[PDB]
Amino acid sequence: MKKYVCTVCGYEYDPAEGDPDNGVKPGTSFDDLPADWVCPVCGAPKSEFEAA
Numbered sequence: 526m527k528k529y530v531c532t533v534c535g536y537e538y539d540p541a542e543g544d545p546d547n548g549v550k551p552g553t554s555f556d557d558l559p560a561d562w563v564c565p566v567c568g569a570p571k572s573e574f575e576a577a
């Protein structure tokens with residue numbers, strides 16, 4: 526229940542799912558994501574992500 530969103534394009538991330546774009550398992554936390562990880566939609570850095 527931490528579904529965040531991008532502050533550039535708007536790509537609701539799923540922590541309970543992960544992220545194949547880069548390679549993440551379900552039940553993971555964004556913060557857990559790598560630094561080289563970025564909104565795989567626009568580009569914005571993970572630093573531009575917040576929990577709405």
Ligand code: NI
Nearest residue numbers: 531534564567
């Ligand atoms: Ni974005």
